[PDB]
Design a protein around this ligand. Structure first.
Ligand code: A1H05
Ligand code: A1H05
Ligand code: MG
Ligand code: MG
Ligand code: MG
Ligand code: MG
Ligand code: NA
Ligand code: NA
Ligand code: NA
Ligand code: NA
Lengths: 1016, 206, 204
């Protein structure tokens, strides 16, 4: 009882030693439930031998493990609270969460951690029946503890564990007692395992996954491997099951393995224990391999996730069942052949996304309802694969990916991004034991899951010799799955797939040791033969995903470009509450954590409550499984489905004339995997009116599926048809000139131009003013996250667009009135102006305008702008003003319902759209320029109408307030409505968010620009 | 050669195919390479001896090839031609006669070179077992080594007898083997396989 | 001084655990002598910074590590003999050497070894100058110990090692003192490292 004490157990300091990653922990294995009935195992009913210890626990926080009193090992602390488990303790306010990207949250001095190490003392009092203690084995299973822990059971020390993302199991058979038992668990926030856990995410701690008790017989199944081999046409498979047993070998022991396709038993095999001769000493007495033949098996894929049920029975020769286990089996073959990743003989096209386990309320505690909501949203947006960035997930995630159909990259919990250099640990043999436990225990847990098709060695840890060793371990133990790893340049000997992060389509990025070549160039470098799948691309931080269509054009054209995984799925924001209890989304330094990396945790396609960002519909369009070509009257549909026929798809088509519908119809799709269907439209309506005819098609699923509602739209496309230019041609407004203003009147309408500023300063409809701010040129935007270009908060890039714009005085440029005149035409008043924008005597821009007010009360505005070639190209070229009116609806003829930019508008459609005014603002958590719609020919708001060919955004927030506000909950609506009408608007970039990423064709570099707008 | 031999296990790779023994095994390989990599006389690394073929062998082979590409790695276990070795290095493969065991056949050295796919050199890690009055047929190996270019020799078993000195009742020393110290069970005179006696006096086979 | 005791150090039983092959052992490296003169290094003369501790040591044999009394950590046992180091203790008649080819000399039950585990308690009293302690680092280097051992320096526990054929080195800078120092080394015949050491040879 001296050796069970805290002074003894703590003094060796196992959390500051990479050579001790566990003590008395059991071997890793696939998920067990220990069914004592074969029918409960087959139907996956809940075993009575697996007890969840989740629920109310006692919890006490301590600033260091030395501060834990010795009485906690025997009795509950009076100062302890009662908390729910699983949970992170930072979500209950005991200390703060820390957001840091690359820089470690502790002092870099491995293997040591600080003396101030926050310690969470968990305890649970609970009952075990005597029947669990009279026979068999009782183990406790912690599915995830962050980041290291010692365990006591009834005041006796049991063991120690360190990987936060894999289960730790301990035998409690010698420690339990009939009646009352008490577990005490001491969780440390930091350890030497923390040096391998430097992912770009919130750093939390605690018992954040499930805790369970499992009872097994003394003679028990200890492991089982399922594999499926095929012939060349996939018409016959062999399910090879390898079972291992612990306990005492008797000759009456048998293992039966049955395969079930639903209720039909499809194959079965029985055998005594005894593997085949392995070497000179013989073979495994405690193992048996059962080979089950399967004729014409239904194949598993993400398109059709066909699953079987394998039941493994350990029984006696007289048919007495000892123990049953089971798993869902998916028949599929993953293989790289001739430079191509093949699934069931067909080359994949990976429509993937990276997904952290994140909940804005529960932190890193994952529940089945959140996982199911994520999977449906992903599949509804045409994703077919997920990368577990950057750790083994909750075990239910793989079961859900098996059932719904998503390919999965399973990734070991190793990231050492903060080291200098990045491979300082991974090239060191003294850390090879630690790293090997994080790879080998992941493969042992997850190797039976069909949805897992690729292993990953971790993320952003350079390239060391330990990576090459662990790659060869996985290839030896599990040849059925390729291994990939990005570190050290993404094409090392530790990966089977070239898997770069943020390699661009056409532009090379020649860094010194780790160049990011263009994806197209990288395939043809001499010697290179591997497929290329980006492990991260299209960094979706805020208003992003510009240039996303360029990737998908390249993926379809190049056979060895097999897709990639978008960064990333969900924003990593946390909910805080204001003084009146209103929740608001928080990021980086919002919890007092310093240093931190601010809004860089929020890179998602969806908000933290799983509401979609506008970029997600661009991804759904570019990733869609039907492609269309129009010839004249004939549509050519091509399926990108590799395995399924289009048996739940109906093609709707419509023709409209400037929003006005003219004809439409439906045709059922009937296209094979990778085939084509020709669809002949009827003789189209030839309208007499002027305007552009548009053809829109949409593929609709009439029947619901497991992941989609009835009527789900899965793909669409729009084309221009014939165009009829208008050759139809359409009292006298009075010009009253004073010294300060030009005032024009026409009936109840009046326009006033200020002669000192040169801008339209006011309009009247009757006695009602319409403008609160004048109508003035605008050359700037409230900067996006891609404009700001910061991944680490300590590093500012002078080549970023916001630094160049600020240093060039774009945000402070003052206009000088060069000319302002007025004249009376035969039927109109013409106002001519010219302004020059200057910063310290440098003329940035010149703007020449003419305002032409006719007799019908229309104001035709013509704008010609000159941009200095040595200033950085402006973010926009347009006009802005604050209208006095606040209206409920915005109606307009242009591209798409959602926010779209010139770099990201392929998913939007030309049509007449009508939305509430709050729908015209995208509430990004870090505020910025948002809500733009491009390609617009007409805009209606209140009594006003604008016509031309422009991009607009309209909101209650000025660009100045957007730039000056760090959080969206601090925004307040201004007095009127801010309108930004842009002749031209820069792209938004998004190849990455820490360097300039707008392509040169999306920049405003033409030097001279022209646009025209008609108000009324 | 790393200090790894698990000959007594059943099967021989029960530990070396187990990931829970991969840390132990890795320390025995990596600390040998770190100590000895500057020595010019060391031209080949070995992963140990008579431990079957496990996944840990393939991992530690790839570690050595990454850290020190200047030396080939060999390993005999699991049939002497696995993916854990750069050299076909069998023990007691005969010149012309095959020995077809089940999982680990000892082909004839000449036949082993021409099996389909095989391209590696062949150097016997043990051959010509010199137990007592032995080394019959030694000239047959050396005729084969000179004739076949990919037969690049081998290592005789072995140099010195492993006998220990005991003393009689009058203090006369005598050479002892196996169960001469009360150790039981033991394997008798099988420790004495040398070309020389334990006092380094040569046997006639030398 | 409770945690330096035999009852504390032994009770975790590091020799029956393949996940603990060392504790507080330094990184492996090529052979060092730390010459403070470039000409002595080039001509391979013997460095004054490398001291051989070979010679006469005190030795006591025990049938198991539990049988070691607690007073051995602080003072020499009166029953101890004086033996030369390096040496195998079976060549001094303390127990017998074992010749076995393939069959392990212990019960095959990894990672466990028998409770009857023959233990060799070595100790050495020796002097260090103050100049070694005033600055720099002092390490002890065991070039080979069969098959596993715990180490104490002046009654404080220093570490643990397991590979019998490679050097184990430990930093002794916090443990040494000017004048008289005493190392105590407890060598175990069998451990979980013995499962990887089944060569056809005498087991000593
Ligand atoms: O590998 C990923 O975790 C990192 N790459 C960029 C992304 O923002 C994240 O920090
Ligand atoms: O590998 C060697 O150690 C073994 N092969 C045969 C020889 O007698 C010895 O037992
Ligand atoms: Mg540790
Ligand atoms: Mg990182
Ligand atoms: Mg050990
Ligand atoms: Mg042997
Ligand atoms: Na492709
Ligand atoms: Na990030
Ligand atoms: Na030759
Ligand atoms: Na022998």
């Amino acid at each position: 009882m001296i050796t069970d004490s805290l002074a003894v157990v703590l003094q060796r300091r196992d959390w500051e030693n990479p050579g001790v990653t566990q003590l008395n922990r059991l071997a890793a294995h696939p998920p067990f439930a220990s069914w004592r009935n074969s029918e409960e195992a087959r139907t996956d009913r809940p075993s009575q031998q697996l007890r969840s210890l989740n629920g109310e626990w006692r919890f006490a926080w301590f600033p260091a493990p030395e501060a834990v009193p010795e009485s906690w090992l025997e009795c509950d602390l009076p100062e302890a609270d009662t908390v729910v488990v699983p949970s992170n303790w930072q979500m209950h306010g005991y200390d703060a969460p820390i957001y840091t990207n690359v820089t470690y949250p502790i002092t870099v001095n491995p293997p040591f951690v600080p003396t101030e190490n926050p310690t969470g003392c968990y305890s649970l009092t609970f009952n075990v029946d005597e029947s669990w203690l009279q026979e068999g084995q009782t183990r406790i299973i912690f599915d995830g503890v962050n980041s290291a822990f010692h365990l006591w059971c009834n005041g006796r020390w049991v063991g120690y564990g360190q990987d936060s993302r894999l289960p730790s199991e301990f035998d409690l058979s010698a420690f339990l007692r009939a009646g009352e038992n008490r577990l005490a668990v001491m969780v440390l926030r930091w350890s030497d395992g923390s040096y391998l856990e430097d992912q770009d995410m919130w750093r939390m701690s605690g018992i954040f996954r499930d805790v369970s008790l499992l009872h097994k017989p003394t003679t028990q199944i200890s492991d089982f491997h399922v594999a499926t081999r095929f012939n060349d046409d996939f018409s016959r498979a062999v399910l090879e099951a390898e079972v291992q047993m612990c306990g005492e070998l008797r000759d009456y022991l048998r293992v039966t393995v049955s395969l079930w396709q639903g209720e039909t038993q499809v194959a079965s095999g029985t055998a005594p224990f005894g593997g085949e001769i392995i070497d000179e000493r013989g073979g495994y007495a405690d193992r048996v391999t059962l080979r089950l033949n399967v004729e014409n098996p239904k194949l598993w894929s993400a398109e059709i996730p066909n699953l079987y049920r394998a039941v493994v029975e350990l029984h006696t020769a007289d048919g007495t069942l000892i123990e049953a286990e089971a798993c869902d089996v998916g028949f599929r073959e993953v293989r790289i052949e001739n430079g191509l990743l093949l699934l069931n003989g067909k080359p994949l096209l990976i429509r993937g996304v990276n997904r952290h386990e994140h909940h804005p309320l529960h932190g890193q505690v994952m529940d089945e309802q959140t996982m199911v909501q994520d999977i449906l949203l992903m599949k509804q947006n045409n994703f077919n694969a997920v990368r577990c960035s950057h750790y083994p997930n909750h075990p239910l995630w793989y079961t859900l990916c098996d059932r719904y159909g998503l390919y999965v990259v399973d990734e070991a919990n190793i990231e050492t991004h903060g080291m200098v250099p990045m491979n300082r640990l991974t090239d060191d043999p003294r850390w090879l034991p630690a790293m090997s436990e994080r790879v080998t225990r992941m493969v042992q847990r997850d190797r039976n899951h069909p949805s897992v098709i690729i292993w990953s060695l971790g993320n952003e840890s350079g390239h060391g010799a330990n990576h090459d060793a662990l790659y060869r371990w996985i290839k030896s133990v599990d040849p059925s799955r390729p291994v990939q790893y990005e570190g050290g340049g993404a094409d090392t000997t530790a990966t089977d797939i070239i898997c770069p992060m943020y390699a661009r389509v056409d532009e090379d990025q020649p860094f010194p040791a780790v160049p990011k070549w263009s994806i197209k160039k990288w395939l043809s470098l001499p010697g290179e033969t591997r497929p290329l799948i980006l492990c991260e691309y299209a960094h979706a931080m805020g208003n992003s995903l510009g240039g996303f269509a360029k990737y998908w054009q390249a993926f379809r054209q190049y056979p060895r470009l097999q897709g990639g995984f978008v960064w990333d799925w969900v924003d990593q924001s946390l909910i805080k509450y204001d003084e009146n209890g209103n929740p608001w989304s928080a990021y980086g330094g919002d919890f007092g954590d310093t240093p931190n990396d601010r809004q860089f945790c929020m890179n998602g396609l969806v908000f933290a409550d799983r509401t979609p960002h506008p970029a997600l519909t661009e991804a759904k369009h570019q990733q869609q499984f039907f492609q269309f070509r129009l010839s004249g009257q004939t549509i050519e549909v091509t399926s990108e489905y590799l395995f399924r026929h289009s048996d739940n798809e109906l093609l709707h088509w419509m023709v409209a004339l400037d929003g006005k519908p003219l004809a439409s119809g439906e045709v059922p799709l009937d296209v094979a995997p990778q085939g084509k269907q020709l669809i002949e439209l009827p003789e189209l309506p030839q309208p007499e009116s002027a305007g552009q005819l548009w053809l829109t098609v949409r593929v609709v699923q009439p029947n619901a599926t497991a992941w989609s509602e009835a009527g789900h739209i899965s793909a669409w496309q729009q084309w221009r048809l014939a165009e009829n230019l208008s050759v139809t041609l359409p009292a006298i407004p009075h010009l009253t000139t004073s010294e300060m203003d030009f005032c024009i009147e026409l009936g109840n309408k009046r326009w006033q131009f200020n002669r000192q500023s040169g801008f339209l300063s006011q309009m009247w409809i009757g006695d009602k003013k319409q403008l609160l701010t004048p109508l003035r040129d605008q050359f700037t935007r409230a900067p996006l996250d891609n404009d700001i270009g910061v991944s680490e908060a300590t590093r500012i890039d002078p080549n970023a667009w916001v630094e160049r714009w600020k240093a060039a005085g774009h945000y402070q440029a003052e206009a000088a009135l060069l000319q302002c005149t007025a004249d009376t035409l035969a039927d109109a008043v013409l106002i001519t102006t010219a302004h020059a924008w200057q910063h310290q005597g440098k003329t940035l821009f010149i703007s020449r305008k003419t305002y032409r007010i006719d007799g019908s009360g229309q104001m035709a505005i013509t704008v010609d702008v000159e941009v200095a070639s040595d200033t950085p190209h402006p973010a926009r070229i347009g006009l802005n003003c604050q209208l006095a009116q606040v209206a409920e609806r915005v109606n307009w003829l242009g591209l798409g319902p959602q926010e779209n930019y010139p770099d990201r508008l392929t998913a939007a459609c030309f049509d007449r759209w009508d939305l509430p005014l709050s729908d015209m603002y995208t509430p990004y958590v870090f505020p910025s320029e948002n809500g733009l719609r491009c390609g617009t020919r007409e805009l209606n708001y209140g009594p006003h109408q604008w016509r031309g060919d422009f991009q607009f955004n309209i909101s209650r927030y000025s660009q100045q307030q957007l730039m000056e506000t760090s959080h969206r909950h601090l925004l307040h609506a201004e007095e009127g409505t801010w309108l930004n009408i842009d002749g031209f608007h820069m792209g938004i970039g998004g190849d990455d968010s820490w360097s300039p990423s707008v392509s040169a064709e999306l920049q405003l570099s033409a030097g001279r620009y022209h646009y025209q707008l008609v108000w009324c």
